[PDB]
Amino acid sequence: MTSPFKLPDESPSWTEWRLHNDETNQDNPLGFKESWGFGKVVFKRYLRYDRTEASLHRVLGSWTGDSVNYAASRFFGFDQIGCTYSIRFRGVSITVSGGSRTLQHLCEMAIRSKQELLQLAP
Amino acid sequence: MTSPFKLPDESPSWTEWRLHNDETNQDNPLGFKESWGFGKVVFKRYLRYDRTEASLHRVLGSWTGDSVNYAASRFFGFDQIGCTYSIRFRGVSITVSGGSRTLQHLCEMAIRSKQELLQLAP
RNA sequence: CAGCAGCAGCCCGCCGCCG
RNA sequence: CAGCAGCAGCCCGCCGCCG
């Protein structure tokens, strides 16, 4: 399976996550989760994010309209399939979803949702 | 039930909707649908929207952080409940959801999602 | 636009068990 | 952070019937 993502997953081990809980707080997690679904197949990432501009720029590079289109187009055919982007950060989940015909518009709304959620104030 | 919405619903009748289909196209609907859910209770609106600045300003007034908090607080208690905003326009659905503890953050992301979707280019 | 139904998926809240 | 399970809701895609 070719993934829509350009960065590898960064899920913390159970021990790393416990170490982080012990030393921080829902509003200061190690990072965020995001996922892309195309019909029944779902790709997920956990990515480290520390709220600096450097870190925001890095994690905004985790998928592009091109990389999502390349991965999704594996699953395309005559009938439309459902496509969905989800992102969860600090207790708030955003999902952008529609049919594969509207995929470009879904990626534009998904990237804007991602940037707005990751920059949401204190 | 006190609604989170400050404008009445504007669902078209079946006949009005058919008249509009006949004379337009998924990218030029009469308006958009939006909904607020608080535990099991859901409030919905269809609102007319024609993509002008006047119209965008009007429909952005359909709920505020205050009006959503007043409606949601009817359903609050000790345990958190799930809160969800959804908006669908031109084939793309955005859902912002989380627990009632994060409701203010959900409203901030919901209003930004709404403005960004309603202004999405051709 | 509305309503009912089938198939499939995702997301949220509560809650248990578990690495 | 991961996995399995229960209860409830929402959203998406396909599809039928219907005002």
Swiss-Prot record, chains A, B:
Q: Name one GO cellular component term.
A: virion component
Question: Which GO MF terms does the UniProt record name?
Answer: RNA binding
Keyword presence, RNA-binding: yes
- Keywords for this entry? Host-virus interaction, Inhibition of host innate immune response by virus, RNA-binding, Suppressor of RNA silencing, Viral immunoevasion
Q: Which GO terms describe its biological process?
A: symbiont-mediated suppression of host innate immune response
Q: How does it assemble?
A: Homodimer.
Function in brief: Viral suppressor of RNA silencing which binds specifically to silencing RNAs (siRNAs). Acts as a molecular caliper to specifically select siRNAs based on the length of the duplex region of the RNA.
What's the family?
Answer: Belongs to the tombusvirus protein p19 family.
Entry protein name: RNA silencing suppressor p19
Q: Which organism is it from?
A: Tomato bushy stunt virus (strain Ja9) (TBSV)
